[PDB]
Amino acid sequence: YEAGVRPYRETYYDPDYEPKDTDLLCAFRITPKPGVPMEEAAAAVAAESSTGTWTEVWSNLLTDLERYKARCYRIEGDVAYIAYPLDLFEEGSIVNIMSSIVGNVFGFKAVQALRLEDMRIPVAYLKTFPGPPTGIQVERDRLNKYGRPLLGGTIKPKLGLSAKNYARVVYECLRGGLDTTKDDENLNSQPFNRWRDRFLYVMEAVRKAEAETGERKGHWLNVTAGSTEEMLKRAEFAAELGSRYIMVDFLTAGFAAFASVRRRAEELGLMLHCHRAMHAVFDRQPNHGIHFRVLAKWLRMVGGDHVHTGTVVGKLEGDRAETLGIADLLREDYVPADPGRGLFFDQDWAGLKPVFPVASGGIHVWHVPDLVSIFGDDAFFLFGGGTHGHPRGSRAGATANRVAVEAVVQARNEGRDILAEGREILEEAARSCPELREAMELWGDVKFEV
Amino acid sequence: YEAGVRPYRETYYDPDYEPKDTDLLCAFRITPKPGVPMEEAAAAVAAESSTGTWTEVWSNLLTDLERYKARCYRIEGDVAYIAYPLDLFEEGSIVNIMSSIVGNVFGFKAVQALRLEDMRIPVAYLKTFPGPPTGIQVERDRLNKYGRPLLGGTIKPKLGLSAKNYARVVYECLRGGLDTTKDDENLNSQPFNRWRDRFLYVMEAVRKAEAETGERKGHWLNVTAGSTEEMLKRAEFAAELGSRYIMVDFLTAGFAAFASVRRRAEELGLMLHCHRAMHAVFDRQPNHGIHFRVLAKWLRMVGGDHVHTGTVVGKLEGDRAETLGIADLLREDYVPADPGRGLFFDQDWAGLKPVFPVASGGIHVWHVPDLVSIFGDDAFFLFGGGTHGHPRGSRAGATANRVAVEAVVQARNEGRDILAEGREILEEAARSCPELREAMELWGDVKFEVEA
Amino acid sequence: YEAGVRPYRETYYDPDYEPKDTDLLCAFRITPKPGVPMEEAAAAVAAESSTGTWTEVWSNLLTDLERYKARCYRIEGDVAYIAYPLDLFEEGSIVNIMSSIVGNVFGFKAVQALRLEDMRIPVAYLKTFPGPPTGIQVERDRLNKYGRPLLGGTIKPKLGLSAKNYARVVYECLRGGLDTTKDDENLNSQPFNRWRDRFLYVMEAVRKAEAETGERKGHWLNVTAGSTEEMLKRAEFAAELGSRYIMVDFLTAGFAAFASVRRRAEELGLMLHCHRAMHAVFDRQPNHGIHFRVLAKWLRMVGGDHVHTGTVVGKLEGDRAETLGIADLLREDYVPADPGRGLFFDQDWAGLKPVFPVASGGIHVWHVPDLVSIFGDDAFFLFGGGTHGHPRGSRAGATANRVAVEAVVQARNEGRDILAEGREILEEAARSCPELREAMELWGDVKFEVEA
Amino acid sequence: YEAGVRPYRETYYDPDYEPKDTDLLCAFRITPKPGVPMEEAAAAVAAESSTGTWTEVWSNLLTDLERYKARCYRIEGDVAYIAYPLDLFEEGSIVNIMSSIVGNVFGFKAVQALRLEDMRIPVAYLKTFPGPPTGIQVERDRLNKYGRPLLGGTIKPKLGLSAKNYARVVYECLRGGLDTTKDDENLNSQPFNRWRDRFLYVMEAVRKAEAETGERKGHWLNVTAGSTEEMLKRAEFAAELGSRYIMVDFLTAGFAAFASVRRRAEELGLMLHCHRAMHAVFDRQPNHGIHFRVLAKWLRMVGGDHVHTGTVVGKLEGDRAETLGIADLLREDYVPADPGRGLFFDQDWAGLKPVFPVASGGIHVWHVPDLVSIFGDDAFFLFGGGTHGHPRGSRAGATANRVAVEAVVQARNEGRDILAEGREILEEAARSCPELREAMELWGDVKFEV
Amino acid sequence: MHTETFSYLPPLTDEEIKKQVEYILKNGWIPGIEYTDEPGPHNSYWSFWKLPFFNAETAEEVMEELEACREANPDCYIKITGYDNIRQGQVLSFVAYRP
Ligand SMILES: O=C(O)[C@@](O)(COP(=O)(O)O)[C@H](O)[C@H](O)COP(=O)(O)O
Ligand SMILES: O=C(O)[C@@](O)(COP(=O)(O)O)[C@H](O)[C@H](O)COP(=O)(O)O
Ligand SMILES: O=C(O)[C@@](O)(COP(=O)(O)O)[C@H](O)[C@H](O)COP(=O)(O)O
Ligand SMILES: O=C(O)[C@@](O)(COP(=O)(O)O)[C@H](O)[C@H](O)COP(=O)(O)O
Ligand SMILES: [Mg+2]
Ligand SMILES: [Mg+2]
Ligand SMILES: [Mg+2]
Ligand SMILES: [Mg+2]
């Protein structure tokens, strides 16, 4: 056989290739090492993410690489489109997808920066995944809540609160009008607050607020832990206590243990809130990493009932146009490509249940008009500081946020332009709600750059 | 109480703070949003990775934030030093470390770019972790191999080979002189090659090569799978077949499932090869992300018996100075700081077992003198393409690499300068090994650029 | 090598050694055999509790004994200070501590008497232990009780009562004002009173008294049994019945089984009362044994929510100064040394939860002012005989003790001197509580000798 | 009813009481507080170890204390004899025995020192216990070893040896003639030597030494750990490896977890070596604690296959006369009282299997005549330092100790006085064994006081 | 129905209540007021009267808040609480008013 190094382009670049509906497609934005042309850079990504390596091997002749190789089939500027045959991937495993698509190709000398912008998951591969264990429709039916965004909020301080104090804040928030509350992503089990203590007291608070308000309540109990076994143990205790919800940091815990908990959540009847902690480590910069829209697709495939999508207007970064596309990717049955929103491919969702977007981080009452305009009804708006930072505390703060959302929803439904009239609508509602007025006055000057 | 928004620095910037020996310390390279002072951006990172949020909350007064808050205690250039009290972390949980230290702070509008360079793990926290299930010393004792780097290689093509063909390549490699072989990181269970089929045939090849050579062999069977339960099932089957090894992609599987596999590997008596697939998604760029030396620390804490570290001279990026620091962090009992290698803190390893560095990716016989000089004996050198790409196949390629390593080790031990005499040492050995001569002739012009 | 016997001091006495913050330190009070120098006896203890034996062995040279050996680093009077490297101990295992530190060295002919006075547990080792499953703060939050010592009492006669009679006494005590009641340490399961029968009826009495008083109640159901499996079975049944508490004799059951029960108590949501039965077999004599302050440290490390500490003024021995030190060791985050209280080292508790002191044994209403002065609010006062021995029975006795505690707490909070005005405070409360007056009249002449 | 404090003596001292064969009897040596007479001190021990407390309680009248009370029935000098009714104790539980007999009575102000010298366990209570899981006879049948003491030795250094080095020393000892080797009592699982590593390598050494010598071998693998579950896990791995033996520190681990492992040992077919670590903390001093003969009885009841009994002549303290009595208590079916040996009661053993005495600690070849004279054939003699401290190492040292035992056994069986001729016998054997000669020369001047 | 600490003593007067508030403030703890119409073992979360008085300086400011809570909720049990954020738990809780 013909030993020696060959160009990646020879086998792994094929501009005549026509993608199949069963192919997995990737849009990579490539920054080649100086002097490396886009075609060889793209071919290297395709080869080293599928079947090839740096020199020709005699064992290539034992198989048919034409059937299994990935192929770059199109290049537009610094964006390369690569097609991967369906047979390359393990059914039902996001872990396997990442092991191929983002396994080694981000660290090659020949490609100095690489960003996975989008991915077309073929229906035939989607069907190997179960999707969310509950889904928006079934979740709204379990909550008996229709016609408005749902209210939530992270308990603060992030860390340092004892179990009983933690449940007091929960109680105040929920009895004041929030639908849910949640553990901070980094609140697991620690010397100042052990998880069994927190789970017990918090669920007393949840049941009490539910009896007193007549509305169904929940707290997103964080099961995130150091091992899958421990996470499953914490999920079992949540169910034993009758919690409607648990919560997992799906990126820090990891997709394999995420998959384990999602299975257990469906078996136990638990709804699954998913926090995207760590995502900004690699989805922020435009030259390198993985765009959040790709993460969002993987999240819906494994099965999360909600996932954070950003706020655009809050303290953490987020683009409005890209966020509109991500919300569609999470909630719709079919999402056509749209260059204006960074959607490189049409995405059929093959009947997988939809996921709640969750907008959280540095938002207060003045943002509600923007938030309702961006996400519509099928979303959670979380107010942590925006609830407990109310001049009169968490109960008054919860009422202010619930009133604000309902007033803006009402105005929108009557035909008013809630962006043009946003302040006016809040002022109208504030005349009948002193808690809302005080929140408006406290944070009126607190703005973040968009 | 006093409601309203305050600058983060009023509570979370404290340059008078003296770090305690139990504090967890971080060195963040910060690029603030234009107009945001460095002190405020560093305070934001400190606040939002420990106790604070964007506005004052009444419930802060229910606890003692002087005890629990993280503090930026030093800003030097564009590096912020931040100290985290021990009580903030869940014992034995890398997952918890990540959820605080890198959970949200990389996406704040106030901070345009953020890169975690290093982390001082306090001894008192390290003792809550079990470390490698085997460790370099026990592993060498299991293999009965002493005094040289160990040889391995990834089976190729990455995907597309049947289980029986896969086993045939393994047999040829191991009977030719490689100590080990391995599944590619992305080979798990797929239509063309299902994991039970591969495990069964491969272990026949391992036992056969072991009996024929007289040397103990192993194959790193990849148990990486879509759920923790499936991975444990594959590890159980590997142990039932008598494999000395399994393999896990610890970052793509994730740390929580990694911890589960590490526990079961110890229970079953399996040594655990860890592939760092996905690491470059986090650690490539110097302005934003997590440097690999942090991930390597977490890897040694959870417990991996080997992890890839880079080759420096191969096809994947890796700076010599940083690679040398990473090797020390994996193998030594105590590593002093050296910002020249990116080590901003000293690291005491509190008696945890050491981890084998693994050098893999685009290397061949001509690189052996450099590799031995960089890593010394306690490392694995992996030749995938550099074995099966030999003109006469995998058996011949395997012998060439084994001979190259041994000849360089012999020369070093005699006192020769294996860098100045690298070429001549290889040529001398090639006189008694035609397999080596053909390898040297085939790849003599194959080079990658290097950075000190 | 050099075979033959060498004096222990040549290798294990090193007064130049500086203890590390990770070393485990011991303070041994040594009485050498006449003719054996103090240095040699202390070296023998150091040697035979770490690495050495009675003659030189070739295998010593296979390891680095400079790293692993214990060292006597200071001899002051008849106290030998010995430092043990962290690597010598198994993480999270009190059993391992005992097997080294008190395993064999108390029976050497060279040492006529040996008493372990104190032990400095290093923070890095403490973090390998889970500590109490509940802790004082969470326990008060579970009980919804704040601002006073809590009331309890042992059901009497110790043995011989049927399960239904047992439950009747519990009902009368709890409905009369006691927060808790308890099985005697030696009541487990016996022909006259089998544990399932007792558990069932007692919990009926607990629920009834709770509903009638409006105050949360508990009974410390003793799960102490002949095997670990049996103890876990009894804890499971207590949890199935809704008990807030179980009880274990942690020294007679032993630390390994104690650890198993502590883990299950947390899993089941049970608070864990720990009785120190057998402690005086080890800790009574000042020339030989283990002082209770060492056992109390181990108890807080494994995880007990309460442990008995002595009363000082009651029927069982307990010195005031030593009792005060023990209480601090159980409840505080950091305890400085004070040899006047037998604390030879400082003790950092590394954020472990605190433990309730429990004062029990031969006490009655007249002791309440002293008990409140000694312990403050965070303690349990147990009146067994002092409740059921009231002239009108257990309900009346219970009310007398509850009233006595509350009146002394009220007086203290107002600024009165509860030691100088102890008698007058009790007499004042007795004017509004006939139960107290009858208790004071019955036992006014019942006193035990006290030692400061 | 008659409330108030009464003397303990009134109810709990009964010098006319005649003990029943079903009573549990205790011999306590009491040091009363000055001015407290022996009768009230003894009555206090009896009362506070059975049914009574410090003041009269109304609930005493709900039961018949005459049936349940313990009673001091005899006082001789400073020794009080107390009888406890059978109904007071939980069947099969040493833990319950200790909780009553030694629970609180050692810490009363009224009794300044207290020593439990002996205990008569009635047959009727013995039958609630299973005794050793193997026993001397069945153990000798499993080993196929008859007619001599068995040889052993602790691996040294106590701590600090890696797993593979540990197994090398084991291999050298066993192939040189030792029947067994053992983990040090404080060797469990530690950073320098983790238990799974040690168990694997050691059993390779055991199987190799067994094949090479043709004699059955064993290593006493220490399962002692921080929890019962972990100890049981280590016992299961020992069995999986085919070990004939495991080892437990029964006092430091504790009797409850001891009972758990003994049950598991019988189920798994494992023989159970028992180390008495911690015993000297409370069995050494003549004025306070628990005599080892009592501990030895409890050990045989729960079920240990061997237990250390001391050497008398070695580095740790031990009395010859008392040790002869303890050996009988562990090995015989019936043991009559003997004041010369400190045996206060006759002890019937109700058919419970016998236990191997184990003599260990600071002994070398010169002690073998004394050791054979004290214990006879049914015992283990352990040589740790006395094996690895041989000038030529562990193999030569093992051969020397095995030869010494066999030569002394042979001489005894031929009718020679092995005490009077001890040196002469060793010198005869040394003429055909250079290893023995070198051991004799090295340690000839190493003597401990008796 | 008893109400835990001090419920076995005669009901406290205004002066006695104030002396307990002074005890709380003297030791640097935070006074607070809670109330409910559903006392009992099942209720671990009484209604807050405002927030804990972190800014309180005198016992008289606390007694004033107790009277305003009583006026607005005369049908409720009302208790005084003292809070320590170092130990992070209540250091005293007693009922000051009963309906
Ligand atoms: O930890 C925090 O900051 C939060 O609890 C917000 O607290 P506030 O509600 O007090 O801002 C959320 O976890 C972030 O919004 C997550 O960011 P994203 O939603 O972008 O993943
Ligand atoms: O997939 C590959 O490319 C390899 O199998 C190398 O194959 P060759 O031996 O044929 O190059 C290894 O996974 C990489 O070296 C990993 O990169 P790192 O070691 O940097 O994690
Ligand atoms: O058995 C007993 O004597 C008790 O029930 C006390 O009963 P009274 O309340 O009737 O005296 C307790 O177990 C002892 O106080 C324990 O001693 P310590 O607390 O010193 O461990
Ligand atoms: O740790 C030790 O000292 C030993 O290993 C002896 O080592 P050498 O054989 O080197 O002396 C044994 O555990 C003791 O004999 C136990 O004492 P006892 O048998 O009296 O319980
Ligand atoms: Mg958060
Ligand atoms: Mg690979
Ligand atoms: Mg008792
Ligand atoms: Mg020993």
PDB file of N, CA and C and ligand atoms in Angstrom, chain A residues 154 156 158 182 184-185 275-276 279 308-310 315-316 358-363 382-386, chain B residues 48 53-54 104 108, ligand 1:
ATOM      1  N   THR A 154     -33.911  33.051  41.954  1.00  0.00           N
ATOM      2  CA  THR A 154     -32.867  32.371  42.706  1.00  0.00           C
ATOM      3  C   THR A 154     -32.811  32.938  44.121  1.00  0.00           C
ATOM      4  N   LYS A 156     -31.089  34.201  47.364  1.00  0.00           N
ATOM      5  CA  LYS A 156     -29.828  34.884  47.601  1.00  0.00           C
ATOM      6  C   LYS A 156     -29.688  35.160  49.090  1.00  0.00           C
ATOM      7  N   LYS A 158     -26.070  33.731  47.282  1.00  0.00           N
ATOM      8  CA  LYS A 158     -25.875  32.465  46.579  1.00  0.00           C
ATOM      9  C   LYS A 158     -25.558  31.350  47.567  1.00  0.00           C
ATOM     10  N   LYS A 182     -35.597  28.840  43.237  1.00  0.00           N
ATOM     11  CA  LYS A 182     -34.566  27.864  42.883  1.00  0.00           C
ATOM     12  C   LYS A 182     -33.279  27.968  43.675  1.00  0.00           C
ATOM     13  N   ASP A 184     -29.304  28.247  43.905  1.00  0.00           N
ATOM     14  CA  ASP A 184     -28.250  28.755  43.041  1.00  0.00           C
ATOM     15  C   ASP A 184     -27.479  27.591  42.437  1.00  0.00           C
ATOM     16  N   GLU A 185     -26.922  27.823  41.248  1.00  0.00           N
ATOM     17  CA  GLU A 185     -26.255  26.737  40.542  1.00  0.00           C
ATOM     18  C   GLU A 185     -25.134  26.131  41.377  1.00  0.00           C
ATOM     19  N   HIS A 275     -29.737  24.181  34.398  1.00  0.00           N
ATOM     20  CA  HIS A 275     -28.902  25.374  34.468  1.00  0.00           C
ATOM     21  C   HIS A 275     -27.677  25.187  33.582  1.00  0.00           C
ATOM     22  N   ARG A 276     -27.318  26.229  32.831  1.00  0.00           N
ATOM     23  CA  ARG A 276     -26.252  26.127  31.839  1.00  0.00           C
ATOM     24  C   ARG A 276     -24.901  26.604  32.372  1.00  0.00           C
ATOM     25  N   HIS A 279     -21.356  27.492  30.469  1.00  0.00           N
ATOM     26  CA  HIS A 279     -21.527  27.666  29.034  1.00  0.00           C
ATOM     27  C   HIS A 279     -20.687  28.825  28.504  1.00  0.00           C
ATOM     28  N   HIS A 308     -31.930  27.876  30.740  1.00  0.00           N
ATOM     29  CA  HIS A 308     -31.671  29.304  30.639  1.00  0.00           C
ATOM     30  C   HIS A 308     -31.222  29.659  29.226  1.00  0.00           C
ATOM     31  N   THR A 309     -31.708  30.799  28.733  1.00  0.00           N
ATOM     32  CA  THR A 309     -31.378  31.289  27.405  1.00  0.00           C
ATOM     33  C   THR A 309     -30.825  32.709  27.427  1.00  0.00           C
ATOM     34  N   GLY A 310     -30.699  33.324  28.599  1.00  0.00           N
ATOM     35  CA  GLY A 310     -30.286  34.705  28.699  1.00  0.00           C
ATOM     36  C   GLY A 310     -31.465  35.659  28.704  1.00  0.00           C
ATOM     37  N   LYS A 315     -27.792  41.462  33.203  1.00  0.00           N
ATOM     38  CA  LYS A 315     -26.382  41.623  33.544  1.00  0.00           C
ATOM     39  C   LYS A 315     -25.455  40.704  32.755  1.00  0.00           C
ATOM     40  N   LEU A 316     -25.974  39.653  32.120  1.00  0.00           N
ATOM     41  CA  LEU A 316     -25.160  38.731  31.339  1.00  0.00           C
ATOM     42  C   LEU A 316     -25.407  38.937  29.850  1.00  0.00           C
ATOM     43  N   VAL A 358     -35.717  30.144  29.803  1.00  0.00           N
ATOM     44  CA  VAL A 358     -35.652  30.748  31.128  1.00  0.00           C
ATOM     45  C   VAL A 358     -34.762  31.980  31.048  1.00  0.00           C
ATOM     46  N   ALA A 359     -35.339  33.145  31.333  1.00  0.00           N
ATOM     47  CA  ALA A 359     -34.629  34.419  31.304  1.00  0.00           C
ATOM     48  C   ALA A 359     -34.336  34.852  32.736  1.00  0.00           C
ATOM     49  N   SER A 360     -33.052  35.016  33.053  1.00  0.00           N
ATOM     50  CA  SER A 360     -32.611  35.255  34.421  1.00  0.00           C
ATOM     51  C   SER A 360     -31.299  36.024  34.406  1.00  0.00           C
ATOM     52  N   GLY A 361     -31.151  36.955  35.350  1.00  0.00           N
ATOM     53  CA  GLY A 361     -29.864  37.586  35.574  1.00  0.00           C
ATOM     54  C   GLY A 361     -29.849  39.095  35.480  1.00  0.00           C
ATOM     55  N   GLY A 362     -29.965  39.758  36.628  1.00  0.00           N
ATOM     56  CA  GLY A 362     -29.873  41.204  36.675  1.00  0.00           C
ATOM     57  C   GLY A 362     -31.090  41.937  36.157  1.00  0.00           C
ATOM     58  N   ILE A 363     -32.262  41.315  36.197  1.00  0.00           N
ATOM     59  CA  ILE A 363     -33.466  41.930  35.656  1.00  0.00           C
ATOM     60  C   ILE A 363     -34.378  42.340  36.801  1.00  0.00           C
ATOM     61  N   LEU A 382     -37.012  34.957  35.876  1.00  0.00           N
ATOM     62  CA  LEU A 382     -36.500  34.760  37.226  1.00  0.00           C
ATOM     63  C   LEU A 382     -35.969  36.070  37.788  1.00  0.00           C
ATOM     64  N   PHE A 383     -36.386  36.396  39.008  1.00  0.00           N
ATOM     65  CA  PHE A 383     -35.956  37.603  39.706  1.00  0.00           C
ATOM     66  C   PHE A 383     -35.370  37.200  41.054  1.00  0.00           C
ATOM     67  N   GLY A 384     -34.043  37.158  41.137  1.00  0.00           N
ATOM     68  CA  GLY A 384     -33.380  36.887  42.396  1.00  0.00           C
ATOM     69  C   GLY A 384     -33.172  38.165  43.178  1.00  0.00           C
ATOM     70  N   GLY A 385     -32.081  38.870  42.886  1.00  0.00           N
ATOM     71  CA  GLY A 385     -31.911  40.198  43.446  1.00  0.00           C
ATOM     72  C   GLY A 385     -33.133  41.068  43.231  1.00  0.00           C
ATOM     73  N   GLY A 386     -33.774  40.930  42.069  1.00  0.00           N
ATOM     74  CA  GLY A 386     -34.979  41.674  41.746  1.00  0.00           C
ATOM     75  C   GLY A 386     -36.185  41.336  42.600  1.00  0.00           C
TER      76      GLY A 386
ATOM     77  N   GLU B  48     -19.943  37.151  42.060  1.00  0.00           N
ATOM     78  CA  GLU B  48     -20.879  36.269  41.374  1.00  0.00           C
ATOM     79  C   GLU B  48     -20.381  34.837  41.263  1.00  0.00           C
ATOM     80  N   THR B  53     -24.868  39.110  44.384  1.00  0.00           N
ATOM     81  CA  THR B  53     -25.603  39.318  43.140  1.00  0.00           C
ATOM     82  C   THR B  53     -25.569  40.814  42.822  1.00  0.00           C
ATOM     83  N   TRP B  54     -26.466  41.253  41.931  1.00  0.00           N
ATOM     84  CA  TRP B  54     -26.378  42.571  41.310  1.00  0.00           C
ATOM     85  C   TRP B  54     -26.992  43.691  42.141  1.00  0.00           C
ATOM     86  N   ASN B 104     -20.942  31.118  36.058  1.00  0.00           N
ATOM     87  CA  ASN B 104     -21.582  32.236  35.384  1.00  0.00           C
ATOM     88  C   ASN B 104     -20.637  33.377  35.037  1.00  0.00           C
ATOM     89  N   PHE B 108     -20.465  37.743  31.880  1.00  0.00           N
ATOM     90  CA  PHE B 108     -20.935  39.043  32.343  1.00  0.00           C
ATOM     91  C   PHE B 108     -20.582  40.134  31.342  1.00  0.00           C
TER      92      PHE B 108
HETATM   93  O1  LIG F   1     -26.392  33.078  39.872  1.00  0.00           O
HETATM   94  C1  LIG F   1     -27.006  33.984  39.261  1.00  0.00           C
HETATM   95  O2  LIG F   1     -26.501  35.056  38.872  1.00  0.00           O
HETATM   96  C2  LIG F   1     -28.501  33.720  38.996  1.00  0.00           C
HETATM   97  O3  LIG F   1     -28.985  33.027  40.101  1.00  0.00           O
HETATM   98  C3  LIG F   1     -29.194  35.094  38.793  1.00  0.00           C
HETATM   99  O4  LIG F   1     -29.277  35.710  40.030  1.00  0.00           O
HETATM  100  P1  LIG F   1     -30.149  37.248  40.006  1.00  0.00           P
HETATM  101  O5  LIG F   1     -31.540  36.749  39.617  1.00  0.00           O
HETATM  102  O6  LIG F   1     -29.987  37.805  41.408  1.00  0.00           O
HETATM  103  O7  LIG F   1     -29.459  38.067  38.925  1.00  0.00           O
HETATM  104  C4  LIG F   1     -28.634  32.837  37.732  1.00  0.00           C
HETATM  105  O8  LIG F   1     -27.984  31.615  37.982  1.00  0.00           O
HETATM  106  C5  LIG F   1     -28.078  33.526  36.454  1.00  0.00           C
HETATM  107  O9  LIG F   1     -29.006  34.386  35.838  1.00  0.00           O
HETATM  108  C6  LIG F   1     -27.644  32.454  35.427  1.00  0.00           C
HETATM  109  O10 LIG F   1     -27.199  33.129  34.301  1.00  0.00           O
HETATM  110  P2  LIG F   1     -27.929  32.572  32.780  1.00  0.00           P
HETATM  111  O11 LIG F   1     -29.398  32.666  33.166  1.00  0.00           O
HETATM  112  O12 LIG F   1     -27.459  33.569  31.740  1.00  0.00           O
HETATM  113  O13 LIG F   1     -27.415  31.154  32.603  1.00  0.00           O
END
